[PDB]
Design a protein around this ligand. Structure first.
Ligand SMILES: [Zn+2]
Lengths: 187, 171
């Protein structure tokens, strides 16, 4: 197990997840296979809040689980859940989450232009630019909504695009060390 | 009752004696003078010497005399930072806020002095558990990145869509 896989796992569990997820992954860094009951008594967390975290890590499939059954000294059977880290699946879901967030950038750029620009303050409903011509009355000579009959201002739709554009530069800058970790772990 | 009730009165007496500033250790008979237990049994005396004052993690021995343990408990900010760093390095888990409050009087001053060094986790029964802020990796994002990350759901989707999406985008 190379230490570069552990370094990238820490950098994605401390920034994109809470401190409870980071402490759970640090245990799996030290020991490859950790029993559930050992880590219950280690972090002394509540039973319900800790199993929900492991349900979340099973949701993102960062780690895998195996189940074994055995008979104890008293004769009562037990079902201990054994959890082990799998970096082969971990790198794929990180890469999948990276391209999904990357493809989210252009489709947010497209939906910024495809968003509505005509808004009526009376009915508080967005109006399509194509539908604004349909609502226009040729007899009146000026454009209004049919239902509300009020003036339409398009200046409200300009300001959410500029906020998204400035966040494009910050998102590209904060992701470069994560991309550098992927390139160093292609072997 | 006998042999199982006088030990609570003894440990309450020397704890309150330590609260008055009595750092110097005391002998067994000196404690027994003010606890009104002069008629205590001799077999109780030998049981206290060999079991009670050595298994208790609040009692330490100096030259055969017993006293409180202020070094193990937290009494200043520097020992709180050192102990919390040791629990982070060895991975022994956090310490409840009530344990620090009873060990360290006026512990709110030490909490506000350290500030962001102590991480607080709110238990459902109002209790708080303290954790070390390991400042080797401090990455934070805006709240709009958090709700966008929560918007995309992967728990209710099979693994065949994850593997196909890699080839769909051509990576
Ligand atoms: Zn209208």
């Amino acid at each position: 197990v190379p230490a570069a896989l552990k370094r990238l796992a820490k950098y994605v569990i401390r920034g994109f997840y809470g401190i409870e997820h980071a402490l759970a992954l640090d245990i799996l860094i030290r020991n490859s296979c950790v029993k559930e009951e050992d880590m219950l008594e280690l972090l002394k967390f509540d039973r319900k809040q800790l199993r929900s975290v492991l349900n979340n890590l099973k949701g993102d499939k960062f780690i895998k689980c195996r189940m074994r059954v055995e008979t104890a000294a008293d004769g009562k059977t037990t079902r201990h859940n054994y959890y082990f880290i799998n970096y082969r699946t971990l790198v794929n879901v990180v890469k999948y989450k990276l391209d999904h967030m990357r493809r989210r950038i252009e489709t947010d750029e497209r939906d910024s232009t495809n968003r509505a620009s005509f808004k009526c303050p009376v009915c508080s409903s967005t109006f399509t630019d194509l539908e604004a011509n349909q609502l226009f009355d040729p007899m009146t000579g000026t454009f209004r909504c049919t239902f509300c009959h009020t003036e339409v201002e398009e200046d409200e739709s300009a300001m959410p695009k500029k906020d998204a554009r400035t966040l494009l530069a910050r998102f590209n800058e904060q992701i470069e060390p994560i991309y550098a970790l992927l390139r160093e772990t292609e072997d | 009752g006998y042999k199982f009730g006088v030990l609570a009165k003894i440990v309450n007496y020397m704890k309150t004696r330590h609260q008055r500033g009595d750092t110097h250790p005391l002998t067994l008979d000196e404690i027994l003078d003010e606890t009104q237990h002069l008629d205590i049994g001799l077999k109780q005396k030998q049981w206290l010497m060999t079991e009670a004052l050595v298994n208790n993690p609040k009692i330490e021995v100096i030259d055969g005399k017993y006293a409180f343990k202020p070094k193990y408990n937290v009494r200043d900010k520097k020992a709180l930072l050192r102990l919390l760093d040791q629990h982070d390095q060895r991975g022994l888990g956090g310490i409840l806020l009530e344990d620090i409050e009873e060990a360290l009087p006026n512990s709110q001053k030490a909490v506000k002095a350290l500030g962001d060094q102590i991480l607080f986790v709110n238990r459902p029964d109002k209790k708080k558990i303290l954790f070390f802020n390991d400042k080797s990796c401090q990455f934070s994002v805006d709240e709009e990145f958090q709700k966008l990350w929560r918007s995309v759901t992967v728990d209710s989707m099979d693994e065949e869509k994850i593997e196909e999406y890699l080839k769909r985008q051509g990576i």
